[model samples]
Target: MSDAGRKGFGEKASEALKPDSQKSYAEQGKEYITDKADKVAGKVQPEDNKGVFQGVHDSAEKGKDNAEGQGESLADQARDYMGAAKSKLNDAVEYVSGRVHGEEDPTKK
Candidate 1:
């Protein structure tokens, strides 16, 4: 019943909307999502390790849940494909690094 306790509805939106001048979209997406996930994961009551593999597993688990009930049933497959893409990207980068440094490829040694 305290009138002073409430600000107008848009006040919070305005507070959250402040953007940086340089506009780093790559960071704008990933880092912001990471922060949002951090906030939610922090609330998990002592929070178990929120590792990347666990995230992937939960996503596939949700995908199967939806296939049985809700939306985006293909999320399970999305994880598999995206996982491979990340794997390929890392493998390629490591291979190039080995070549650039005159070192043996991981495949060779």
Candidate 2:
């Protein structure tokens, strides 16, 4: 084939292999494996796992209260337990937002 014809053919083939959806090949493969593993493990996946964060938040709040009960100064308790809760909240928000937007995996980096 002429150089121009071969170049055109390569471009067409490249486009043909690309997925129609926004997900990349790595994402599609990860999802497929997760689904298959979940099936094999007899696990029913929840639609969303955000509920776990509520528990984390609640526990942190309780810890803050308990720290005060144990004679820690209010400011000290706020610095400790409140900081913990804030970190967790930030992480949970980051995780959920990333998932919703189909962002690249943070853990991989």
Candidate 3:
């Protein structure tokens, strides 16, 4: 399994054991820091060369957006892979169960 799958499963299990709204604490903290960093950068940008600063900031933001979008795509792909694996696992389990109960072999049919 991919790191995303393991992390997602861990997160879900953690959330199940936690109270409502507590699961997002880390995400909220990350957002808070990101917002603060953006605010600071906005205030510190050069007024005389605002165009330059704006260009650089826009480029950086675009890169961040693209990377995050790619990450989401990869995570989705990982999820689809895991889903297929789970389906195969279920089929194997059923095949074993059938064999134990003297049911007809699905593979032969």
Candidate 4:
């Protein structure tokens, strides 16, 4: 699965486990991924971008991971667009962790 797909599933599971939380963690995760996708589009405007986007679109539509392996195939382009999303998500997690810790300076450094 694409890193985001796996993340989305993990987030959904987290939400399912926490019904009392103020907001659905799954929603947060989905939003994060959606935002990340948008950011990637802005950065990697491959001339054949449609093919890449379509892969994701079709895979999502099938919802079975069989017809299109957008989930897994993302690895094919993994080198092209992996770091940005990973960094963004990592920063988000750190922000939340800092908040929970009541750290005056959230920057780990």
Candidate 5:
């Protein structure tokens, strides 16, 4: 409820841009998020600075493990990690810490 990405038209437009008769709409739309996500993934790969990476990374594994369909499963690591549709940034901070200290998957138990 406090300050987050939701600022004002700036954020509204930060999530928007100008374009004309262009089919790169496909390219542009896809490129924007992919570029952003991939760049973040690059850092998360080796650095492992935060546990959200592993949390998101683990979810990607479980997604595939459960799917048994999408052979291209790992790709989701970048997808879910990037698109914080469910923004729980600080929320995961504590969870991961507790995760390291103990063993628990509160989502289930």
Candidate 6:
């Protein structure tokens, strides 16, 4: 075969063998081993932010305490709690928005 013809033949042969070449016996076996494994692995796991809730809660508590010290009354304390809750909730919203929009790590940005 000519050089060009040989190259074309090789390309076609490579394409034909590509799928077989990429198949992993271990992975194939794993797939058949358990339906639960397949179902679980198919879904992306949530990024576990350990202590994220605790941190938010602590900050909110601190804010509530500070506001309570500054004011005097159940109504004022309730308002403070609401304000703190709203602020903490916004952080959660922004975190989720960043994740959904492919930010992955808002802290990095």
Provide the lDDT at 101 for model 6.
74
**Candidate 3 residue pairs in clash (backbone atoms < 3 Å):** none
Candidate 5 lDDT at 72 equals 63
Output candidate 2 Cα RMSD: 15.4
RMSD of each: 14.4, 15.4, 26.1, 22.6, 21.3, 14.7
Q: Which structure is stronger by TM-score: 3 or 4?
A: 3
Tens digits of per-residue lDDT for model 4, 2-109: 435565886777656876655566678879888999888776866765675567656544333333345566663453345445545665676566465776764657
Candidate-wise lDDT, in order: 0.59, 0.63, 0.60, 0.60, 0.57, 0.61
**Candidate 2 Cα outliers beyond 4 Å, as residue runs:** 1-39, 45-70, 103-109
Q: Candidate 2 at 6: error in angstroms?
A: 64
The positional error of residue 59 in candidate 3, measured at the CA in angstroms, is 15
Residue 19 error, candidate 5, Å: 16
Predicted model with the maximum lDDT = 2
Of candidates 3 and 1, the better by TM-score: 3
Instruction: Say which prediction, candidate 4 or candidate 6, comes out ahead on TM-score.
Output: 6
User: Cα deviation of 94 in candidate 3 (Å)?
Assistant: 75
Model 1: weakest 10-residue lDDT segment is 62-71
Better of 4 and 6 by lDDT: 6
Q: Show the colliding residue pairs in model 2.
A: none
- Poorest lDDT segment (10 consecutive residues) of candidate 6: 42-51
